[PDB]
């Protein structure tokens, strides 16, 4: 509520940002004007075509100063942020000076003093000194890019003005290129060939890596952009840190009846070359990725932003909580479900049940009832969930009205259907299996379910590639990637007449027989020199989609009884995998942030401050299995939500005064635990492993 | 290694620091060693850290106290006596003439003059409460820094490595920009780009305020 | 330690500059 330099600066370039819009908005009503324009208002001036390339010059004549403002600006930011992260990955972690180091942590600088001014303003003079002759070697550059933020709408009104001009086979085959979900805009993806998959996929390889906040680039690989050596300055790439030195070659690269009004079409030219924003999106990327992660709430609310285009998970996933909730609180339709606590008749119940309502979907709410067992609140919902969960993904037998659904291809934890010469009841399972799926997203649970990656991309209809069978069996991927490589060797004949392969494959038990033909006329065609491509693809898309094609169609058909084909757009595999089962591990961080602590004991042992600490302790020394029977006795779930609006109660312990006579006691559909204070840690510890196993 | 370097150990060879002051408490920079038990009360000057102690687990102390290097207690201090001046001047002469041991830091990553000058700066305050009148301490501090600053000083090669640190065809083995050929191809363009300035701006420093006892 | 063991209640104003991820920390204030 006082005065500052910077609000003033934000506001005035906000309002720049809005005038540019309006001027985008008027040049591109130019090719129609006589049909939107000539047509309905009384009252309009003649345009002609050369009237047009008037305008034209004369808007690209005055935007010059401010987009060599704004493009040095953008270069030095983008050259200071490669270079620290050039010099985290040559550095030791253990260094204070180390760019991955909890001192460099903002809000833990703050937290630790319950440096001088002098010192802050003496080195980034120093780092202003350095920065000008390239003499800023193992020191990590000074900057504050949240004071930046004038900046950001000067840059996103001109992406918006150049995105608006600009919209108005064997190795080259769509099988071996990534979607989408893997590329980076302006970039050039790896080479799917010859590089291993420690070094391109790391997520296929550990697939713990997924958190909310994880980034893209340390999931799908390193890009790279070919920019180098050209004289325009589009064309190099920003490496110098210097404001003045980049606004000099900015500057140095700048001063180096007729046709109908339809066939008039305007291009993008500020510095003599015609200008993509795909580049200036691919040259910018470390800087739009701060922007985006700082400057959301006010910068990326303007109409048109390119900060919620390219947004990460927290954007996509509340607005479909938010549609979620929405159609929830839609329709007042309920649904009663009664179960026991068995596998063969709570399978067979549910499948009844599940029959007989709605044998898309208006459901409201979803309440579950244990025969012969008390509980009427929310989280019933959630046991009945996991039971679930567990009851398909175990594996005994078929509770009869024969093979198990699922099996494991090659990774832990991940899991693809088994068609086993399916009927009517294998389908009529998975189609239960994806109304259930859909039902828990509509009503904000988890259910501890886990596929592969390519049985996400079929329900949510997208295509798959070669790159997906990575995370359906990663070994024989990297022998099939092994034997392309040698494929193109200068012996040629010499490997390929080695071992003889044909087009017949041997299939394995989960999958069903063996000797089974890929292309027509079977065996007796071999490898030629050059089919092996062919022969590739063929295999991938036989194992991933030829195979299991039905219970993959019945799944989809049951997701979308429930959920239409409105919500299911622009949404990814990961974001998928982190809405339905939760962030997979369980962290400490997550669960301290998440707790509040209720204090109604009275009691004073210094003010607490030590139960706190070795409960956290106790928290953190423990085993993943017991942590996962932890949160089990917190709120009936093996798994936790990615974020704090998935919990509609807050998780809270509450302490109780002390008496050590008795377990804590669980209050699920409140997400509540009361805990009885102890003296000692090993009791504690002791009384909480008694109490967690049940 | 950088350590055993002759023109290095020339240069710090230094007359110990119990041979000018006896069971006085002066102010100077007191060093540790694990090896040697010089743990709790017993400690020793920085020519001993320097010549003495030298593959050791010797360290420095923030909270130094006064002492009087109790390092004959414990150890055969190699520093106790001081050879012929004239001799290792003539010595130091014929290998800045002959060599090229002057451009090879040590294995602190520190150049020679860069050494010699916080050996001076370091010096100046601590010999200024001598006092003129078990082993021998009836002896001169040493005045040896000071010569052999104006020497190397006149000097095309060492001035000039000096000044031309940091830069592409010198290689400091403390820093991170040393080793990148097992990076990617833009991190090595990046970290190519710049130039280090750090020891030389420390040198420079060392050299304008905190040696402000001599002009020459 | 330094890290805090319960729920701050998010504490109203915010910068963004919390939300920078883990390798771009350093390049933010507040
Ligand atoms: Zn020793
Ligand atoms: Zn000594
Ligand atoms: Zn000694």
Same mark, same amino acid.
């Given at each position: 509520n006082a005065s500052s330099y910077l609000t003033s600066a934000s506001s005035l370039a906000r309002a720049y940002s809005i005038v540019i819009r309006q001027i985008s908005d008027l040049m591109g009503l130019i090719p129609k004007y006589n049909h939107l324009v000539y047509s309905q208002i009384p009252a309009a001036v003649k345009l002609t075509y050369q009237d047009a390339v008037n305008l034209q010059n004369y808007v690209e004549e005055k935007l010059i100063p401010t987009w060599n403002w704004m493009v040095s600006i953008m270069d030095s930011t983008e050259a200071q942020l490669r270079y620290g992260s050039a010099l985290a990955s040559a550095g030791d972690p253990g260094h204070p000076n180390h760019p991955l180091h909890a001192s460099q942590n903002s809000a833990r600088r703050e937290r630790m003093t319950?440096?001088?001014?002098?010192?802050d303003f003496l080195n980034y003079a120093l780092s202003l000194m350095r920065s000008h002759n390239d003499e800023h070697s193992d020191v990590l550059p000074v900057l504050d890019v949240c004071s930046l933020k004038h900046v950001a709408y000067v840059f996103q009104a001109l992406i918006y003005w150049i995105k608006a001009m600009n919209q108005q086979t064997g190795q080259n085959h769509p099988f071996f290129r990534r979607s989408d979900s893997m590329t980076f805009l302006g970039c050039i993806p790896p080479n799917p060939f010859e590089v291993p998959l420690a070094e391109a996929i790391p997520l296929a390889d550990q697939p713990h890596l997924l958190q909310p906040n994880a980034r893209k680039e340390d999931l799908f690989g390193r890009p790279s952009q070919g920019l180098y050596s050209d004289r325009n300055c589009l064309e190099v790439l920003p490496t110098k840190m210097s404001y003045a030195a980049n606004l000099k070659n900015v500057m140095n690269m700048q001063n180096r009846e007729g046709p109908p009004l339809t066939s008039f079409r305007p291009q993008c030219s500020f510095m003599g070359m015609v200008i993509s924003h795909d580049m200036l999106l691919g040259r910018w990327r470390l800087s739009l990725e701060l922007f985006g992660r700082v400057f959301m709430e006010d910068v990326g609310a303007e109409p048109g932003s390119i900060l919620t285009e390219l947004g990460g998970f927290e954007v996509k996933e509340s607005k479909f909580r938010?549609?979620? $909730? !929405?159609l929830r609180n839609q329709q007042s339709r309920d649904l009663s479900l009664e179960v026991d606590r068995d596998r063969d008749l709570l399978i067979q119940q549910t499948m009844?049940?599940?029959?007989?309502?709605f044998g898309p979907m208006a459901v409201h709410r979803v309440k579950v009832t244990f025969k012969d067992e008390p509980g009427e609140g929310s989280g019933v919902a959630r046991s009945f969930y996991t039971a679930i969960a567990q009851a398909f993904?175990?594996? $005994? !037998?078929?509770?009869?009205?024969?093979?198990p659904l699922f099996y494991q291809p090659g990774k832990r934890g991940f899991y693809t259907p088994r068609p086993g010469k399916n009927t009517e009841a294998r389908l009529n399972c998975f189609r239960n299996?994806?109304?259930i799926l859909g039902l828990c997203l509509l009503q904000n649970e988890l259910c501890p379910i886990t596929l592969n990656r390519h049985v996400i991309k079929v329900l949510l209809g997208r295509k798959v590639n070669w790159h997906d069978?990575?995370?359906?069996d990663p070994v024989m991927y990297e022998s099939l990637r092994q034997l392309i490589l040698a494929s193109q060797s200068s012996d040629a004949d010499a490997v390929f007449s080695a071992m003889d392969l044909a087009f017949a494959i041997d299939l394995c038990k989960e999958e069903g027989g063996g000797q089974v033909e890929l292309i027509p006329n079977g065996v007796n065609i071999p490898v030629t020199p050059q089919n092996v491509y062919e022969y590739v693809r063929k295999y991938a898309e036989h194992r991933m989609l030829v195979v299991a094609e039905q219970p993959l169609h019945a799944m989809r058909k049951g997701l979308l009884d429930v959920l239409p084909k409105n919500s299911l757009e622009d949404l990814t595999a990961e974001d998928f995998r982190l809405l339905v089962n939760g962030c997979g591990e369980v962290n400490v961080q997550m669960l301290i942030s998440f707790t509040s602590f209720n204090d109604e004991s009275g009691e004073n042992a210094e003010k607490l401050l030590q139960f706190k600490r070795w409960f956290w302790s106790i928290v953190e020394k423990m085993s993943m299995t017991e942590r996962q029977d932890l949160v089990y006795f917190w709120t009936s779930s093996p798994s936790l939500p990615a974020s704090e609006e998935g919990f509609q109660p807050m998780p809270s312990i509450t302490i109780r005064p002390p008496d050590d006579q008795h377990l804590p006691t669980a209050n699920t559909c409140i997400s509540r635990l009361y805990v009885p204070l102890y003296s000692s840690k090993q009791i504690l510890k002791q009384k909480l492993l008694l109490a967690i196993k049940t | 290694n950088p350590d055993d370097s002759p023109l290095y150990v020339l240069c710090c060879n230094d007359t110990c620091s119990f041979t000018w002051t006896g069971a006085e408490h002066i102010n100077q920079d007191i060093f540790e060693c694990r090896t040697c038990g010089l743990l709790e009360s017993l400690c020793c000057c920085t020519e001993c850290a320097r010549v003495c102690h030298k593959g050791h687990d010797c360290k420095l102390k923030r909270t130094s106290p006064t002492a009087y290097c109790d390092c004959w207690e414990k150890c055969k201090c190699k520093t106790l006596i001081a050879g012929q001046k004239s001799a290792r001047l003539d010595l130091l002469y014929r290998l800045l003439t002959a060599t090229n041991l002057v451009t090879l830091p040590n294995s602190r990553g520190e150049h020679l003059?860069?050494?010699?000058?916080?050996?001076?700066?370091?010096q100046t305050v601590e010999h200024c409460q001598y006092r003129p009148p078990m082993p021998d301490h009836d002896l001169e501090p040493p005045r040896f820094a000071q010569l052999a600053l104006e020497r190397v000083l006149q000097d095309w090669n060492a001035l000039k490595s000096m000044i031309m640190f940091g830069s592409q065809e010198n290689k400091d083995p403390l820093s991170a920009s040393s080793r990148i050929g097992h990076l990617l191809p833009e991190e090595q363009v990046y970290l190519n780009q710049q130039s280090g300035t750090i020891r030389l701006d420390c040198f420079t420093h060392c050299l304008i305020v905190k040696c402000t006892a001599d002009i020459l | 330690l330094d890290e805090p063991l319960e729920r701050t209640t998010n504490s109203s104003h915010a910068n963004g500059a919390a939300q920078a991820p883990r390798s771009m920390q350093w390049a933010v204030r507040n």
């Open positions: 319950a440096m001088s001014a002098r010192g938010r549609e979620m $909730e !929405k009844r049940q599940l029959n007989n309502h993904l175990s594996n $005994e !037998k078929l509770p009869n009205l024969n093979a299996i994806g109304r069978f990575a995370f359906f | 003059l860069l050494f010699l000058v916080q050996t001076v700066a370091r | -």
